[PDB]
Paper text:
We have utilized class A enzyme [name]-M-14 from [name] as a model system, because it is the most widely distributed extended-spectrum β-lactamase (ESBL) globally. The clinical usefulness of β-lactam-based antibiotics has been significantly shortened by the emergence of specific bacterial enzymes referred to as β-lactamases (BL), able to hydrolyze and functionally inactivate β-lactam antibiotics. In this study we show the crystal structures of the β-lactamase [name]-M-14 with covalently bound Bortezomib and Ixazomib at high resolutions of 1.3 and 1.1 Å, respectively. Ixazomib is well defined in electron density whereas Bortezomib show some disorder which corresponds to weaker inhibition efficiency observed for Ixazomib. Both inhibitors mimic the deacylation transition state of β-lactam hydrolysis, because they replace the deacylating water molecule.
Bortezomib can be written as Pyz-Phe-boroLeu, which stands for pyrazinoic acid, phenylalanine and leucine with a boronic acid instead of a carboxylic acid. Bortezomib and Ixazomib bind to the active site of [name]-M-14 to the catalytic side chain of Ser70 forming an ester with the boroLeu warhead. Based on the high resolution and the quality of the data, we were able to refine and to compare the occupancy of Bortezomib and Ixazomib bound to the active site. Both inhibitors are observed with full occupancy, but the N-terminal end of Bortezomib is disordered due to conformational alternatives. We see a different conformation of Bortezomib beginning at the central Cα atom of the inhibitors. The Pyz-Phe moiety is less well defined in the electron density map. Obviously, the Pyz-Phe moiety is not stabilized by any specific interactions and can adopt alternative but quite similar conformations. The Phe reveals non-polar interactions with Gly238 and Asp240. The Pyz ring occupies a similar space as the acyl group of several β-lactams and is highly solvent exposed. The inhibition assays with [name]-M-14 revealed an IC50 value of 13 ± 1.2 µM for Ixazomib, but 67 ± 1.4 µM for Bortezomib. The fivefold weaker inhibition rate of Bortezomib resembles quite nicely the observation of an elevated degree of disorder for the Pyz-Phe moiety of Bortezomib.
Residue numbers in the entry: 25 to 57, 59 to 238, 240 to 289
The structure:
């Protein structure tokens, strides 16, 4: 059985030509609205949230960990290094790496977070520790973006990611200083203007993390504070049947516009 919300999302999916996954959690009453909410999708750069959160968790017991400088070598650079390239043969702290990964989607920064956690499996272990049984990170940047249909590597479901994003930002999977820091980072994101944010009222505060990959994969996950109302969490994942498909951030904006009706 479908609601009008799910019917609108299905029509958007049909017009888009791809596969759309949506999960909305309304924290006023803990209700969820799902569309393909238990299907796996490639996370691409939305996985940077889990990596940054895992480092934040380590910092709860190592109080100066975020200020620890990490060396950036020429050989560390990968395909998209807008911040890290300014620090070659220098350093970035774990806080600076987290901010670069989250707010600019820097892939060298993400790889340093993964390395701090002992590899992709360390990010997955953190997910399991906070109750996320679905997330899996298998690869570093940039190979985590291959986004092959049917491949479970580097995937999660919309429901699982929405639940985790809620617990990380509004709940207490992290300590208070750390939860607030993650919110500060997400709110300052620079890459999200055409994605979920473009489908919501400008008066709503949004923290989000985008992602992109092969198969035209176009993703965004967000924590949202509507005016006068309890906050929401929204995941919008989108992937397409052909490898060379173009990005479709407009589909995410359209999904957000649908979800916002009545909220
Ligand atoms: B993330 O893992 O989603 C990451 C963020 C991006 C801004 C650097 N994405 C990528 O590394 C993708 C992978 C990709 C592979 C094949 C097809 C499409 C995408 N890279 C990019 O989107 C990209 C775009 N412009 C410059 C650099 N990188
Ligand atoms: Cl991105």
């Amino acid at each position: 059985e479908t609601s009008a919300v799910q019917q609108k999302l299905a029509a958007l999916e049909k017009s888009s030509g791809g596969r759309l996954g949506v999960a909305l959690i309304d924290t006023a009453d803990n209700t969820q609205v799902l569309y393909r909410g238990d299907e796996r999708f490639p996370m691409c750069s939305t996985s940077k949230v889990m990596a940054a959160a895992a480092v934040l968790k380590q910092s709860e017991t190592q109080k100066q960990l975020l200020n620890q400088p990490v060396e950036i070598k020429p050989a560390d650079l990968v395909n998209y290094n807008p911040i890290a390239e300014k620090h070659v043969n220098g350093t970035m702290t774990l806080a600076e790496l987290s901010a670069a990964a989250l707010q600019y989607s820097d892939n060298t920064a993400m790889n340093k977070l993964i390395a701090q956690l002992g590899g992709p499996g360390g990010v997955t272990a953190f997910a399991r520790a906070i109750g996320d049984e679905t997330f899996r990170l298998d690869r570093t940047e940039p190979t985590l973006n291959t986004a092959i249909p049917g491949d479970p590597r580097d995937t999660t479901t919309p429901r699982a990611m929405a639940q985790t994003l809620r617990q990380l930002t509004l709940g207490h999977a992290l300590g208070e200083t750390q939860r607030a820091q993650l919110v500060t980072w997400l709110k300052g994101n620079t890459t999200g203007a055409a994605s979920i944010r473009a489908g919501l009222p400008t008066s709503w505060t949004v923290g989000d993390k985008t992602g992109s990959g092969d198969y035209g994969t176009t993703n965004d996950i967000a924590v949202i504070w509507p005016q006068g109302r309890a906050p929401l969490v929204l995941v919008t994942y989108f992937t397409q049947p052909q490898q060379n498909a173009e990005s479709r951030r407009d589909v995410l904006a359209s999904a957000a516009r649908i979800i916002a009706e009545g909220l």
